[PDB]
Amino acid sequence: TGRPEWIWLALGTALMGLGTLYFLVKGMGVSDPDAKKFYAITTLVPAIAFTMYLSMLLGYGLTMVPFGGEQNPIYWARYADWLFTTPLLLLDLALLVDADQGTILALVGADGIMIGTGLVGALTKVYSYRFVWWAISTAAMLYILYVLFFGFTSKAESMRPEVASTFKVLRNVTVVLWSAYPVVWLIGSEGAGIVPLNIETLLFMVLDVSAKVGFGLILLRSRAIFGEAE
Amino acid sequence: TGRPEWIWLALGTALMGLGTLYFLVKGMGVSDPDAKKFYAITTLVPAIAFTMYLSMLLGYGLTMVPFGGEQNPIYWARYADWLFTTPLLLLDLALLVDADQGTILALVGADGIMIGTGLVGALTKVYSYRFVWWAISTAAMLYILYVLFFGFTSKAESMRPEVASTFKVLRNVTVVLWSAYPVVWLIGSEGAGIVPLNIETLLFMVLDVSAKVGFGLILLRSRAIFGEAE
Amino acid sequence: TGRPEWIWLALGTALMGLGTLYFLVKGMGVSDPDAKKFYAITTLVPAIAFTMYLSMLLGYGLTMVPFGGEQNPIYWARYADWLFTTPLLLLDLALLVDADQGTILALVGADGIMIGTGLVGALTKVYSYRFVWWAISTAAMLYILYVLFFGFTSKAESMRPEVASTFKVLRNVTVVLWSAYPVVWLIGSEGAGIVPLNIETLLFMVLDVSAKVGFGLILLRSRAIFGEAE
Ligand SMILES: CCCCCCCC/C=C/CCCCCCCC(=O)OC[C@H](O)CO
Ligand SMILES: CCCCCCCC/C=C/CCCCCCCC(=O)OC[C@H](O)CO
Ligand SMILES: CCCCCCCC/C=C/CCCCCCCC(=O)OC[C@H](O)CO
Ligand SMILES: CCCCCCCC/C=C\CCCCCCCC(=O)OC[C@H](O)CO
Ligand SMILES: CCCCCCCC/C=C\CCCCCCCC(=O)OC[C@H](O)CO
Ligand SMILES: CCCCCCCC/C=C\CCCCCCCC(=O)OC[C@H](O)CO
Ligand SMILES: CCCCCCCC/C=C\CCCCCCCC(=O)OC[C@H](O)CO
Ligand SMILES: CCCCCCCC/C=C\CCCCCCCC(=O)OC[C@H](O)CO
Numbered sequence: 001t002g003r004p005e006w007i008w009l010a011l012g013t014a015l016m017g018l019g020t021l022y023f024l025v026k027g028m029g030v031s032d033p034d035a036k037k038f039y040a041i042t043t044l045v046p047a048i049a050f051t052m053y054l055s056m057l058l059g060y061g062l063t064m065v066p067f068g069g070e071q072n073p074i075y076w077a078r079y080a081d082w083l084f085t086t087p088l089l090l091l092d093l094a095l096l097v098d099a100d101q102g103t104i105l106a107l108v109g110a111d112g113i114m115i116g117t118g119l120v121g122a123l124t125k126v127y128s129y130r131f132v133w134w135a136i137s138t139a140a141m142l143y144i145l146y147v148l149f150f151g152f153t154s155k156a157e158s159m160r161p162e163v164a165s166t167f168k169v170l171r172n173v174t175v176v177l178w179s180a181y182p183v184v185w186l187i188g189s190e191g192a193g194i195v196p197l198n199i200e201t202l203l204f205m206v207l208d209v210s211a212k213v214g215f216g217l218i219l220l221r222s223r224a225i226f227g228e229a230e
Numbered sequence: 231t232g233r234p235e236w237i238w239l240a241l242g243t244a245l246m247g248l249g250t251l252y253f254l255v256k257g258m259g260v261s262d263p264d265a266k267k268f269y270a271i272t273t274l275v276p277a278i279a280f281t282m283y284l285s286m287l288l289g290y291g292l293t294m295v296p297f298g299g300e301q302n303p304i305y306w307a308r309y310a311d312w313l314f315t316t317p318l319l320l321l322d323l324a325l326l327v328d329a330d331q332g333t334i335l336a337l338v339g340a341d342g343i344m345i346g347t348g349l350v351g352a353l354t355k356v357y358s359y360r361f362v363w364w365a366i367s368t369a370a371m372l373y374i375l376y377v378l379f380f381g382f383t384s385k386a387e388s389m390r391p392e393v394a395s396t397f398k399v400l401r402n403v404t405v406v407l408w409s410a411y412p413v414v415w416l417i418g419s420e421g422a423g424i425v426p427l428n429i430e431t432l433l434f435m436v437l438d439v440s441a442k443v444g445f446g447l448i449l450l451r452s453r454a455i456f457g458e459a460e
Numbered sequence: 461t462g463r464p465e466w467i468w469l470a471l472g473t474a475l476m477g478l479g480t481l482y483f484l485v486k487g488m489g490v491s492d493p494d495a496k497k498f499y500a501i502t503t504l505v506p507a508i509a510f511t512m513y514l515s516m517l518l519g520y521g522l523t524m525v526p527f528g529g530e531q532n533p534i535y536w537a538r539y540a541d542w543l544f545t546t547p548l549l550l551l552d553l554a555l556l557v558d559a560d561q562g563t564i565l566a567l568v569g570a571d572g573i574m575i576g577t578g579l580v581g582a583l584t585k586v587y588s589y590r591f592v593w594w595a596i597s598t599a600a601m602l603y604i605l606y607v608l609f610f611g612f613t614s615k616a617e618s619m620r621p622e623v624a625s626t627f628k629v630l631r632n633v634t635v636v637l638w639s640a641y642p643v644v645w646l647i648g649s650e651g652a653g654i655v656p657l658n659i660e661t662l663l664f665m666v667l668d669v670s671a672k673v674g675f676g677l678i679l680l681r682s683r684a685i686f687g688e689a690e
């Protein structure tokens with residue numbers, strides 16, 4: 001393809017596809033109802049990402065947005081992916097710690113605001129206003145990270161030790177990886193335009209595969225996803 | 231801004247923002263799991279409205295629709311707000327009366343039809359057909375109001391007296407305020423065009439703040455949102 | 461109207477409308493909470509389809525997509541219908557057999573991928589790539605049909621005999637009817653273009669009414685939707 005970033009979109013498609021197939025085969029035969037929930041959530045995540053990476057590779061998930069006096073290539077398909085995959089990742093963490101329903105609704109709702117405002121920012125034609133939406137989205141992200149540390153960590157330590165241990169690892173992975181996304185957006189083609197689109201696409205591919213397939217490998221190898229039984 | 235209705239969009243943004251912050255601080259420290267559910271639902275409502283009012287203020291949430299031989303300004307962001315906030319408001323009422331799952335699904339589904347058909351009507355280019363969609367949406371609204379009076383009132387009176395009392399007030403607020411929306415649409419810029427857009431925008435701002443922040447102030451001050459405990 | 465397929469859109473609108481009204485009246489007075497769930501899910505299905513058939517009849521739900529060097533009429537409103545009605549139909553089947561939550565999430569998620577990739581395929585401007593999306597969507601469909609036969613049939617036979625019996629019939633109806641959709645798409649205006657749009661529209665109308673109103677008549681006449689009580 002004639003876009004230099006094609007190679008990273010192709011690799012991302014392949015890695016999300018391979019991760020989906022691996023999780024699908026690994027979950028074959030699992031009969032524990034708690035483990036089935038985690039396999040279902042965790043396999044859906046790279047499956048959705050696979051479809052949206054493929055849409056970017058083939059050019060469907062790209063649009064041109066005028067701002068700063070240029071026509072700027074915006075990959076809108078990222079937001080369609082993240083709208084569904086980021087609440088699913090949060091549901092994996094919430095189910096692990098048996099979070100109450102009100103906390104789950106708060107997290108999923110804040111996450112929806114985060115991604116939706118990011119999408120508005122990405123498509124906004126007045127340059128200075130793009131950063132207003134970025135700030136609102138980032139505030140929603142900070143709310144999510146606060147709950148994961150000062151609601152979820154406190155509950156986990158009261159549960160089975162393998163649940164506490166696996167939650168603590170996946171919480172730390174999540175906070176580090178998710179915090180990089182607003183930074184890549186700010187310095188890349190959607191924001192200040194300091195990093196070119198080809199490098200930005202590489203960075204999001206590394207983050208996405210780590211936050212989805214890496215995350216899932218840790219979770220689905222854990223004893224924490226099974227009920228305690230004899 | 232050069233649009234006369236800007237002042238009402240600005241005030242609406244500010245009031246939804248202030249209401250979100252108030253509910254967020256008030257819900258700090260609440261540990262009762264039932265109360266947490268109500269705080270989460272009720273704080274999300276003005277937070278979503280805040281983002282969509284801001285999108286209208288900055289001009290993102292506006293499009294031009296040709297009908298009647300003119301280019302007509304249609305604020306489409308209202309429907310994106312209401313798609314999520316109106317089912318959340320109904321969930322507050324349904325949880326208060328411990329409604330059965332089938333009734334909740336009926337209400338949320340009718341509400342989705344109401345808002346979705348309103349959006350189609352708002353974007354329809356053949357003038358006479360706009361009113362066909364308005365009629366279908368209004369029928370869905372009447373179904374909702376019927377359930378709130380002839381399903382929900384009957385259940386409430388069988389529950390704790392503080393639940394019955396708070397439900398009856400919030401039901402009455404809801405029926406009065408929600409019934410005004412189809413009337414404003416019909417006589418305003420989306421419909422017959424008798425009331426100008428600046429006044430229409432004022433009317434929806436008053437209704438929205440009352441139906442979201444007013445509603446939430448009544449609910450979150452009530453004893454009904456807490457479990458009965460010693 | 462000047463489109464030859466109008467007659468089938470009109471008939472489909474009428475039949476979905478009549479089926480909605482019939483199910484609404486039949487469900488009046490039902491007080492069993494399990495039966496209420498099934499009436500709510502099953503009445504919503506033709507109600508949503510009614511609105512989307514009407515949008516196609518009036519011309520709102522149609523767009524033109526260039527591919528193969530022509531402007532091709534694509535009825536996009538079908539996908540908006542199916543996005544909501546196909547998971548509702550699967551929920552009817554899953555509730556009947558008391559499926560576990562993980563299996564329900566797998567089914568609904570695969571169904572979302574099926575319809576979303578179908579929509580991307582329908583709107584794709586590069587002709588050969590339309591069939592890549594068709595293949596991905598069809599793979600998701602095959603996953604769904606596998607679960608209905610090799611997860612759901614095995615559970616049903618362990619339940620009440622009237623539940624097993626009604627599930628087996630509705631499963632067979634579902635597999636036969638749903639399998640025809642990818643074939644109609646492939647040979648019709650969205651795909652290879654061998655069957656003209658007027659005949660394609662007839663075929664989808666027959667399938668839709670059978671898969672929604674036919675399905676619902678079988679289910680809502682069954683004893684299986686009521687709890688076992690004295
Ligand atoms: C997990 C095991 C594998 C670990 C792998 C980690 C990779 C993640 C980071 C990649 C950034 C690469 C940056 C590449 C920078 C090239 C940009 C460039 O060409 O910049 C020069 C320009 O011409 C003038 O400034
Ligand atoms: C809660 C405590 C505060 C209560 C506040 C309630 C306000 C709600 C209603 C406002 C309608 C105002 C209508 C303003 C009409 C002005 C339109 C106008 O200018 O019309 C004249 C025109 O030039 C030729 O007909
Ligand atoms: C339930 C009881 C009622 C059962 C009813 C079942 C109907 C379903 C199938 C219809 C296909 C009809 C196909 C009509 C074909 C006409 C196309 C045509 O005109 O093709 C000739 C063309 O001019 C040169 O090839
Ligand atoms: C001027 C101020 C403007 C408005 C501020 C920016 C709005 C968007 C940002 C963040 C979303 C905040 C989180 C929304 C969800 C809160 C849920 C909540 O309150 O949950 C309580 C529950 O007890 C928990 O377990
Ligand atoms: C419990 C459930 C909670 C759910 C919480 C969800 C909150 C989402 C809020 C705001 C983002 C809205 C974003 C809307 C973006 C639409 C952009 C679009 O499609 O624009 C069309 C065109 O490109 C230009 O007119
Ligand atoms: C806890 C997780 C938080 C995650 C969110 C952290 C956000 C703030 C980070 C960086 C902003 C630094 C300033 C970037 C703006 C630079 C503007 C500019 O003009 O830069 C010129 C350029 O450096 C040469 O050409
Ligand atoms: C010609 C007729 C055309 C069709 C009519 C217009 C369709 C749209 C209008 C209203 C939605 C109706 C409500 C949809 C949901 C009904 C749910 C239901 O039946 O719920 C039963 C349950 O027992 C409860 O607890
Ligand atoms: C339990 C879950 C129940 C959920 C019930 C939901 C029912 C929604 C039904 C119909 C409205 C569909 C509205 C679709 C509007 C799309 C308009 C649009 O985006 O148009 C694009 C462009 O502007 C022009 O081609």
Ligand SMILES: CCCCCCCC/C=C\CCCCCCCC(=O)OC[C@H](O)CO
Nearest residue numbers: 368372375408409410412413416417422424
């Ligand atoms: C229970 C809640 C129900 C809520 C829904 C109630 C709907 C009917 C209300 C009003 C319609 C009145 C007729 C409006 C149409 C007027 C058309 C016209 O030409 O008006 C000329 C104008 O009055 C001078 O220029």
Ligand SMILES: CCCCCCCC/C=C\CCCCCCCC(=O)OC[C@H](O)CO
Nearest residue numbers: 017020036039040043562563566570599600
């Ligand atoms: C190169 C390969 C590319 C990727 C493949 C194509 C992706 C889209 C197709 C099918 C969706 C598959 C189903 C997605 C949901 C799986 C859910 C699951 O694993 O559920 C386990 C649970 O135990 C159950 O009860």
Ligand SMILES: CCCCCCCC/C=C\CCCCCCCC(=O)OC[C@H](O)CO
Nearest residue numbers: 048051063080084568569572573576577579
């Ligand atoms: C538990 C919840 C699981 C939910 C699982 C859902 C999976 C959906 C995945 C992919 C399809 C995405 C389709 C996006 C299509 C948007 C097309 C569009 O609107 O295009 C705009 C314009 O026409 C051109 O730029």
Ligand SMILES: CCCCCCCC/C=C\CCCCCCCC(=O)OC[C@H](O)CO
Nearest residue numbers: 598602605638639640642643646647652654
């Ligand atoms: C279990 C359910 C599975 C459902 C899915 C089954 C998919 C495969 C079916 C048919 C493809 C047959 C080939 C169609 C392609 C024909 C291409 C062509 O050029 O046809 C010329 C035409 O026949 C004269 O003009």
Ligand SMILES: *C/C=C(C)/C=C/C=C(C)/C=C/C1=C(C)CCCC1(C)C
Nearest residue numbers: 118134137138141178181182185211
């Ligand atoms: C699978 C993909 C993941 C986990 C993606 C996560 C994305 C975010 C945390 C995005 C956050 C953003 C902001 C906080 C500000 C605006 C830009 C966004 C959407 C990139």
Ligand SMILES: *C/C=C(C)/C=C/C=C(C)/C=C/C1=C(C)CCCC1(C)C
Nearest residue numbers: 348364367368371408411412415441
């Ligand atoms: C927070 C906002 C609220 C509670 C908005 C409520 C909106 C409605 C009840 C809208 C109803 C409409 C009709 C019944 C007919 C068509 C026009 C609509 C969407 C305005």
Ligand SMILES: *C/C=C(C)/C=C/C=C(C)/C=C/C1=C(C)CCCC1(C)C
Nearest residue numbers: 578594597598601638641642645671
């Ligand atoms: C009420 C409508 C129903 C039950 C519609 C069902 C539709 C499908 C099973 C569609 C499947 C498709 C594929 C498997 C491939 C691509 C084309 C689709 C969307 C037609």
